[PDB]
């Protein structure tokens, strides 16, 4: 956890079908928001923390 260093991901096409395309990807559901609506929802400045 102490690393906190990663490359930046932005201004990209966040197609959630790519998440299912990867074999070991399992969790993509949001607790408060249904993934069905999230399939085409748009966000700004979203990066995966390391």
């Amino acid at each position: 956890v102490y690393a906190w260093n990663r490359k930046r991901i932005s201004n990209c096409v966040a197609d959630y079908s790519v998440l299912y395309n990867l074999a070991p990807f399992f969790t993509f559901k949001c607790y408060g928001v249904s993934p069905t609506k999230l399939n085409d929802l748009c966000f700004t400045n979203v990066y995966a923390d390391s």
Partner: protein, 49 residues
């Protein structure tokens, strides 16, 4: 019903999951109850894959 078991929490009724998004859908609040039978030793197949 028969399932793996590693993802029963997500595919549980009333919530979205892998198998839940695959085949079976349930209403927002169905009157029935859900019961999961956790087979421990004997009901688990040890020979057939």
């Amino acid at each position: 019903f028969v399932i793996r078991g590693d993802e029963v929490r997500q595919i549980a009724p009333g919530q979205t999951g892998n198998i839940a998004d695959y085949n079976y859908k349930l209403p927002d609040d169905f009157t029935g109850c859900v019961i999961a039978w956790n087979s421990n030793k004997l009901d688990s197949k040890v020979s057939g894959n």
